Amino acid sequence: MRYAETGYVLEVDLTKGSIERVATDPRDTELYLGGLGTNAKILWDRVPPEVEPFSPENLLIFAAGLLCGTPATGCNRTIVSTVSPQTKLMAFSMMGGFWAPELKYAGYDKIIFRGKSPELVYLYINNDKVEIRDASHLKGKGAIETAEIIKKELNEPRAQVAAIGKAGENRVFYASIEQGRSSASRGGIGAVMGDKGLKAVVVRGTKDLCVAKPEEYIGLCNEVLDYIKHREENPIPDVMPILAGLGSPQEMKVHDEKWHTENFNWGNARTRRKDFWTDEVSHAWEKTMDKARTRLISCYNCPMKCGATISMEGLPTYMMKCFTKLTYTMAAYSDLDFGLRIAQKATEYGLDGFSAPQVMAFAFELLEKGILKDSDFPGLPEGNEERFFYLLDKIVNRDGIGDILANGTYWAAQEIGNGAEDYAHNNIKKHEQLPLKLSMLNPIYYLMYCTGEKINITQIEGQFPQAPYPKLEQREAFVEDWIQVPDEKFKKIFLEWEPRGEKSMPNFPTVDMCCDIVDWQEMMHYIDDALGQCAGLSSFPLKPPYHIHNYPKFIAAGAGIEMDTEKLKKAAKRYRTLVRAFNIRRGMRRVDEQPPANHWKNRFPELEKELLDSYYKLKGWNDDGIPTKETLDDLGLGYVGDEFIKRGILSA
Amino acid sequence: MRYAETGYVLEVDLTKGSIERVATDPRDTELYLGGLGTNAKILWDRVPPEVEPFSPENLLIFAAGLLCGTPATGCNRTIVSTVSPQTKLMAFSMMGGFWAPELKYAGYDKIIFRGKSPELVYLYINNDKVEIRDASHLKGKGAIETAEIIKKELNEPRAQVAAIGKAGENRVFYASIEQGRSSASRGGIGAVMGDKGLKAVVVRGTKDLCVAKPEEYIGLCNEVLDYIKHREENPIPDVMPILAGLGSPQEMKVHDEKWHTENFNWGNARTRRKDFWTDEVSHAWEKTMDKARTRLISCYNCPMKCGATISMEGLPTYMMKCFTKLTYTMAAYSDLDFGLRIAQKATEYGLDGFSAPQVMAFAFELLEKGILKDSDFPGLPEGNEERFFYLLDKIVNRDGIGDILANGTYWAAQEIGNGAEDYAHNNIKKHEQLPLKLSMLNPIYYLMYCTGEKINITQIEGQFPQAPYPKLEQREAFVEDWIQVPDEKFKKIFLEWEPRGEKSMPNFPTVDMCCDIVDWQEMMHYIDDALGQCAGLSSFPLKPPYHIHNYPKFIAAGAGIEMDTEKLKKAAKRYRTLVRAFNIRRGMRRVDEQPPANHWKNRFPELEKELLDSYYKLKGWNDDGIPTKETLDDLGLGYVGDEFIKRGILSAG
Numbered sequence A: 001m002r003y004a005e006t007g008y009v010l011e012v013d014l015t016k017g018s019i020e021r022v023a024t025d026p027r028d029t030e031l032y033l034g035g036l037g038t039n040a041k042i043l044w045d046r047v048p049p050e051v052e053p054f055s056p057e058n059l060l061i062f063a064a065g066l067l068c069g070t071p072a073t074g075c076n077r078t079i080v081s082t083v084s085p086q087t088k089l090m091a092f093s094m095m096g097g098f099w100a101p102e103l104k105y106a107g108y109d110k111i112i113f114r115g116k117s118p119e120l121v122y123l124y125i126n127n128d129k130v131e132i133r134d135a136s137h138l139k140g141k142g143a144i145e146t147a148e149i150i151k152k153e154l155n156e157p158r159a160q161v162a163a164i165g166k167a168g169e170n171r172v173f174y175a176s177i178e179q180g181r182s183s184a185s186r187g188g189i190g191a192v193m194g195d196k197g198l199k200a201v202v203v204r205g206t207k208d209l210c211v212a213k214p215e216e217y218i219g220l221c222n223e224v225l226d227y228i229k230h231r232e233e234n235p236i237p238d239v240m241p242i243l244a245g246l247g248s249p250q251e252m253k254v255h256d257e258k259w260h261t262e263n264f265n266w267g268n269a270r271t272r273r274k275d276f277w278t279d280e281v282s283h284a285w286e287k288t289m290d291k292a293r294t295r296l297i298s299c300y301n302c303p304m305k306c307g308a309t310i311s312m313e314g315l316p317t318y319m320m321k322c323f324t325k326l327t328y329t330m331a332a333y334s335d336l337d338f339g340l341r342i343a344q345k346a347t348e349y350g351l352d353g354f355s356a357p358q359v360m361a362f363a364f365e366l367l368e369k370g371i372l373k374d375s376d377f378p379g380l381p382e383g384n385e386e387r388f389f390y391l392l393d394k395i396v397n398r399d400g401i402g403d404i405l406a407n408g409t410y411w412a413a414q415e416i417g418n419g420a421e422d423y424a425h426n427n428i429k430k431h432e433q434l435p436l437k438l439s440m441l442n443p444i445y446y447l448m449y450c451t452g453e454k455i456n457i458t459q460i461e462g463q464f465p466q467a468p469y470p471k472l473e474q475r476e477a478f479v480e481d482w483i484q485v486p487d488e489k490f491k492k493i494f495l496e497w498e499p500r501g502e503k504s505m506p507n508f509p510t511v512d513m514c515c516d517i518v519d520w521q522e523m524m525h526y527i528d529d530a531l532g533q534c535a536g537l538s539s540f541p542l543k544p545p546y547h548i549h550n551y552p553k554f555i556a557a558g559a560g561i562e563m564d565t566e567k568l569k570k571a572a573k574r575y576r577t578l579v580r581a582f583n584i585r586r587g588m589r590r591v592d593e594q595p596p597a598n599h600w601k602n603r604f605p606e607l608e609k610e611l612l613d614s615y616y617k618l619k620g621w622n623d624d625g626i627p628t629k630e631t632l633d634d635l636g637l638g639y640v641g642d643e644f645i646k647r648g649i650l651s652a
Numbered sequence B: 001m002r003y004a005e006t007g008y009v010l011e012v013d014l015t016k017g018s019i020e021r022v023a024t025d026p027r028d029t030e031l032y033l034g035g036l037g038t039n040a041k042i043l044w045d046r047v048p049p050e051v052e053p054f055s056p057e058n059l060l061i062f063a064a065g066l067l068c069g070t071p072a073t074g075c076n077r078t079i080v081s082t083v084s085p086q087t088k089l090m091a092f093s094m095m096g097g098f099w100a101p102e103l104k105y106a107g108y109d110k111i112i113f114r115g116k117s118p119e120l121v122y123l124y125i126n127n128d129k130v131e132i133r134d135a136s137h138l139k140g141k142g143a144i145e146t147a148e149i150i151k152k153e154l155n156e157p158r159a160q161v162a163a164i165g166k167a168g169e170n171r172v173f174y175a176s177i178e179q180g181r182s183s184a185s186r187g188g189i190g191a192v193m194g195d196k197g198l199k200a201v202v203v204r205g206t207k208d209l210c211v212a213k214p215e216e217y218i219g220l221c222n223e224v225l226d227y228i229k230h231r232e233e234n235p236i237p238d239v240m241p242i243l244a245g246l247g248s249p250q251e252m253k254v255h256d257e258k259w260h261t262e263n264f265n266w267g268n269a270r271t272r273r274k275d276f277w278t279d280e281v282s283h284a285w286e287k288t289m290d291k292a293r294t295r296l297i298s299c300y301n302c303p304m305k306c307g308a309t310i311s312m313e314g315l316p317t318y319m320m321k322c323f324t325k326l327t328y329t330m331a332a333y334s335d336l337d338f339g340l341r342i343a344q345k346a347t348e349y350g351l352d353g354f355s356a357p358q359v360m361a362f363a364f365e366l367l368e369k370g371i372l373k374d375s376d377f378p379g380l381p382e383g384n385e386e387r388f389f390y391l392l393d394k395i396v397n398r399d400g401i402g403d404i405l406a407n408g409t410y411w412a413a414q415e416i417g418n419g420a421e422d423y424a425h426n427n428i429k430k431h432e433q434l435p436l437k438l439s440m441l442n443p444i445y446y447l448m449y450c451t452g453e454k455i456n457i458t459q460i461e462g463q464f465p466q467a468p469y470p471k472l473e474q475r476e477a478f479v480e481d482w483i484q485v486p487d488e489k490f491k492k493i494f495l496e497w498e499p500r501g502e503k504s505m506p507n508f509p510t511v512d513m514c515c516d517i518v519d520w521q522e523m524m525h526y527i528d529d530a531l532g533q534c535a536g537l538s539s540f541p542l543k544p545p546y547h548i549h550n551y552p553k554f555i556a557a558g559a560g561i562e563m564d565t566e567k568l569k570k571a572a573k574r575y576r577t578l579v580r581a582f583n584i585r586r587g588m589r590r591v592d593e594q595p596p597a598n599h600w601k602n603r604f605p606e607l608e609k610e611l612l613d614s615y616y617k618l619k620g621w622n623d624d625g626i627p628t629k630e631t632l633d634d635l636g637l638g639y640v641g642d643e644f645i646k647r648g649i650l651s652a653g
């Protein structure tokens, strides 16, 4: 008897229209846990480097986390995985809401899509009943719009739908997948879905989902709820609002956006506006938000209600959370009202709200520098906001210039030329970063930009504070009840750490301290992404209810496998290394692991080399960023080491 | 977590040399239990009827039964499965000894071979280590001899080896697979294995094998050991020694062979010798066997020591059990000394001891009657004994007439022509039956010859007595402690049944009594062949320690899944019916289900129709032997019914 997981996946061949339920190997659960980890095993095993993103043999995997469908608060994440058309590397992407738990109640842990459907279709799951339906009547329709039409069609009001918009259908490289108040946003996972002729995945489930140790498990869940209450009455002192509590960045609740608007860059990650947040702006954006925000709403089985239904006059309602509230606004040098309006269109089209704003601001920089012509934007309006709505439509239809921009700043620049590459200045591994151009090198963030397989800073940070406290007693207070640390050395680091002087960055924390910090922050994310646990109650906020000390108890009581703190750390390291190996096999080397040239105004080449060198060694990789044969063997990834040798990636 | 079964199989593609471990689906254990049952599910959805026996897409499966590797006494059977090159139907074949347990301790429930290796290879398993080795130095070597060379070669003296001899390498249609004192003998599984270029499968295993409810399970084991003790202090009264106790027919222990020699047909199932067993012959054969039998030896975890190492002067030692002690002897009209000598060669070649002798005896009949002439046997020696050794070599090398004879009597007859057919008079579905030509219709045995999917009367019979007692007092004594019957109906039947008179065959037992009796006897074999339990302690002998009432307890406490008598009965029904449907998909029909014209001297067309008409209904089949859509939906085999409807085998409505 399997627990927590269902022990079954669906294999779907969209070319042949075949559908097969397949029992999983319980050993893969012990080694790789579930979610992202087991996705990485499937991709390693079945997608060799000769496979292109828009090749039939590319896989699109929808995974429900190990503990999704259990009573674990906030444990509801879907992990979508494939090879990215933008980065040509592995792309995994997380989605909240209600879809993953529904897949579990239907009896499945994953759906694995291979092939391509000639006709636009959608997959319909209802417990044991699985079938492929014609979706041509859904062509071009928005992601939310599509879900609503389908639930009508099928008479399944309680079904969960993950869908693409027109942007997905047209294989826009940063096209997302949307489900109610949730989104698998980055990496172009939506483009692959469109490429396979897959319009939506509709699931309804009414079966039981069992846990192994019933009372132990519910006990841990209450422990978490108690901690969520306590923690809510005790926000982290002296820290800006949107990051003092639990949850995803609480930007739908908090009106104050001084930190973001004054420290992040506007336009094409170009312009700092140090004194932007006037009283006049604060009042105007609060008015817009109060009027537009219908309700704060939660994902499945969670009280934090991070997201919000948003209603702009004369526009369909949509749902939003976190930073997409500002990225369109800031990239366009506009106001919050504009942001919320265009975000509505872009959500329905199904576009990544991080990359898309920067692509458009990239385009207008080129148009202004004359590198692009005005004849490349035919019928172009000349009001600034109108031009953003205009280009959004060119991109989503791959129309003329939109066809090039639809490929992202890296490829658009390379395809354009005339020094367009100079303006694609905010990429790592061909993927747009957050619009941050700070002054002083940050040793911890340096390592995170360089090595993160999600290639997104907000999805590798969290557990260690972003800044030190000025006063010693503030730090003593903070580390006092910091139970989430793996080792008390993390307390001592934060005690010593100071904003200014001989114990400040970039020289302190030390290189070894920075390696431990990045390793821990990263580890927690990978655990979240295998369990399906929302980072909002785990790896993202300071002092979460889930941590390295009770996670082993959740896994043991939930899935009925042996698990403790050490074994879990090792598990996390195992599929973190496997994801690494997957990208190594696709061509990634040390050379690729470098932040934008202009990401800090003060650079320290020798400190940075020493940082990356020491981090690689901590990981157990060689100086080209490849996992060694020794590390692979000890992790039980011998088959990886063997293939590395056979492929010349490692020499014996 | 999985119990009793390991939960994994090895997928092996011999064309490409790919080796892959795959986890199984615990729902398949629920529906089909293990062993033969799950073999059948595998064959059903991976081997469609367009596939030939020697097609690279044919599958060759080695399965350890569900309870092999546990402490259950005598639970050690490998189940081999493939499509038969001789019958073109499913072939399953059981081999005892030590191989299945070892596979379980290595960590696997089955090995599934597909494709064909261009070069001769063997597969070597040692726990998680699995590799394909070149076997070319082994070409032509005997099965046991191959085993010994491999173990020394690998430095694996405790490994278990299943191997083919020359006969298998040459695709003899009745080639066997041999393993110590054990053999997967019938249906030609050895030819498929040679055809795939696979010379042996070596397995060493040293991992734990777990049960769900430790205490309950060992409790049940102790109960069987107890029953085995008292059952051996109480042989069934007034019955032939070889079949009065537990185990496979105890022919290596019992020297009294009066029963066989006087009631079975010598030669090509031809000659009865009503008074063969003289005092002079008994002393002669007793002397032979005393000298030749080195030791009585057992399969894994069993006290019955049914088999024997046999050592003939100047020959390599081999092992033997059951009726091959006599088949060569009788086919050649010879003595036991000859039987044991030629059976040594035949065993090393890897040949089925039932078919081979009849094939040779049939050849010499045709020679006598001039259908074959001396030109067909260049260099044929003069002596009778010497001729048999000559023809054995011809057949194994598919040399000359041997090439035709290596196909079995049914195909050889058709190819030889000129009246050869009339002499291939002991086949059912192109498969040689035991040399039995009785005088009066036995209605119970009529049913078992017709429908049995193993197509061998000795692997479907057992639980009901073959004959009645002369006195009622005897009948009453027997049924008093007969706890094994599924219902009490069976005790009453045996009480009424008498040798001569009103309550005697073929009219008693009635047509309905015969069907219940044949259902039960068959079901127990299918349970044994799923669990890997030796029939010698179960479906074969009267009053066994395993039976329908405690088997569910073993499955529950061993495998950790719900089971009770009714669910087990229905499970056995489920995969027995699946095997039926597989043979239907490959074209079998009621027409194929006749015994030989001459199997009994006194026949009854009317009763025989009614017998088979009734039995079909009880199984839930058509009047053409096909499982109806309703009975298929009931057994959770809707998907079978569907395919049958798609292919026009069952009409919709």
Ligand SMILES: CC(C)(COP(=O)(O)OP(=O)(O)OC[C@H]1O[C@@H](n2cnc3c(N)ncnc32)[C@H](O)[C@@H]1OP(=O)(O)O)[C@@H](O)C(=O)NCCC(=O)NCCSC(=O)C1=CCCC=C1
Pocket (backbone or CB within 6 Å): A249, A263, A322, A323, A434, A436, A437, A438, A439, A440, A441, A442, A445, A457, A458, A466, A467, A499, A500, A501, A504, A505, A506
């Ligand atoms: C962003 C941030 C405000 C930057 O802080 P700061 O402004 O202090 O940093 P700064 O620009 O480097 O330097 C300022 C001045 O100090 C000076 N100086 C430096 N070192 C000095 C020394 N040792 N001694 C003396 N002076 C030293 C410098 O030279 C400079 O002076 P200048 O006028 O002469 O040029 C802070 O939160 C941080 O550190 N973030 C971490 C990294 C990050 O990107 N985090 C956010 C990730 S996204 C996220 O989390 C999200 C959340 C929600 C939704 C979406 C995303």
Ligand SMILES: CC(C)(COP(=O)(O)OP(=O)(O)OC[C@H]1O[C@@H](n2cnc3c(N)ncnc32)[C@H](O)[C@@H]1OP(=O)(O)O)[C@@H](O)C(=O)NCCC(=O)NCCSC(=O)C1=CCCC=C1
Pocket (backbone or CB within 6 Å): B249, B263, B322, B323, B434, B436, B438, B439, B440, B441, B442, B445, B457, B458, B461, B466, B467, B499, B500, B501, B504, B505, B506, B602
């Ligand atoms: C063969 C057997 C030993 C005795 O048989 P019998 O000779 O007694 O029966 P018979 O030959 O039919 O008839 C004799 C005479 O009586 C007459 N007559 C008959 N009924 C009559 C009546 N009611 N009333 C009046 N008269 C009746 C007949 O007409 C005839 O008279 P006739 O002078 O005119 O010709 C008994 O076990 C049996 O029949 N088994 C059947 C199943 C079978 O095949 N078993 C073995 C399966 S393999 C196995 O188990 C192995 C084990 C170990 C290793 C390998 C394999």
Ligand SMILES: Nc1nc2c(c(=O)[nH]1)N[C@H]1C(S)=C(S)[C@@H](COP(=O)(O)O)O[C@H]1N2
Pocket (backbone or CB within 6 Å): A077, A094, A095, A096, A097, A181, A182, A183, A184, A185, A248, A249, A321, A322, A323, A458, A459, A528, A529, A532, A533, A534, A535, A536, A540
């Ligand atoms: N396991 C996991 N949970 C996560 C994240 C993640 O990367 N991994 N991202 C967080 C952030 S920063 C946001 S804005 C939301 C995004 O929710 P969505 O995927 O439904 O749009 O998920 C949060 N939960």
Ligand SMILES: Nc1nc2c(c(=O)[nH]1)N[C@H]1C(S)=C(S)[C@@H](COP(=O)(O)O)O[C@H]1N2
Pocket (backbone or CB within 6 Å): A092, A093, A094, A095, A176, A182, A183, A184, A185, A186, A187, A320, A321, A322, A323, A324, A346, A347, A350, A351, A352, A353, A354, A458, A459
């Ligand atoms: N369409 C869409 N894109 C989006 C978002 C969203 O909510 N909707 N969230 C943004 C935020 S805040 C984050 S943290 C990332 C989430 O990354 P992921 O969905 O690939 O896991 O997407 C960004 N892009």
Ligand SMILES: Nc1nc2c(c(=O)[nH]1)N[C@H]1C(S)=C(S)[C@@H](COP(=O)(O)O)O[C@H]1N2
Pocket (backbone or CB within 6 Å): B077, B094, B095, B096, B097, B181, B182, B183, B184, B185, B248, B249, B321, B322, B323, B458, B459, B528, B529, B532, B533, B534, B535, B536, B540
């Ligand atoms: N499960 C099962 N056990 C069985 C049998 C069988 O058909 N199924 N055949 C019995 C008979 S009649 C004999 S002679 C021996 C033969 O053992 P072997 O296959 O190792 O040569 O197995 C006995 N045990």
Ligand SMILES: Nc1nc2c(c(=O)[nH]1)N[C@H]1C(S)=C(S)[C@@H](COP(=O)(O)O)O[C@H]1N2
Pocket (backbone or CB within 6 Å): B092, B093, B094, B095, B176, B182, B183, B184, B185, B186, B187, B320, B321, B322, B323, B324, B346, B347, B350, B351, B352, B353, B354, B458, B459
């Ligand atoms: N080579 C060989 N053939 C043999 C035997 C044997 O032990 N060795 N056993 C005979 C007996 S007594 C039986 S019951 C069957 C067993 O059939 P199976 O091994 O195909 O299951 O084969 C017969 N042919």
Ligand code: SF4
Pocket (backbone or CB within 6 Å): A074, A075, A076, A096, A097, A246, A247, A248, A297, A298, A299, A300, A302, A303, A304, A305, A306, A307, A534, A535, A536, A537
């Ligand atoms: S913390 Fe917020 S984003 Fe995470 S599950 Fe709860 S409501 Fe959803």
Ligand code: SF4
Pocket (backbone or CB within 6 Å): B074, B075, B076, B096, B097, B246, B247, B248, B297, B298, B299, B300, B302, B303, B304, B305, B306, B307, B534, B535, B536, B537
């Ligand atoms: S009864 Fe005989 S053939 Fe069966 S397992 Fe025991 S020793 Fe082997």
Ligand SMILES: [Mg+2]
Pocket (backbone or CB within 6 Å): A093, A094, A095, A096, A182, A183, A184, A185
């Ligand atoms: Mg997401």
Ligand SMILES: [Mg+2]
Pocket (backbone or CB within 6 Å): B093, B094, B095, B096, B182, B183, B184, B185
């Ligand atoms: Mg056998």
Ligand SMILES: [W+6]
Pocket (backbone or CB within 6 Å): A248, A249, A322, A323, A458
């Ligand atoms: W976010």
Ligand SMILES: [W+6]
Pocket (backbone or CB within 6 Å): B248, B249, B322, B323, B458
């Ligand atoms: W036998």
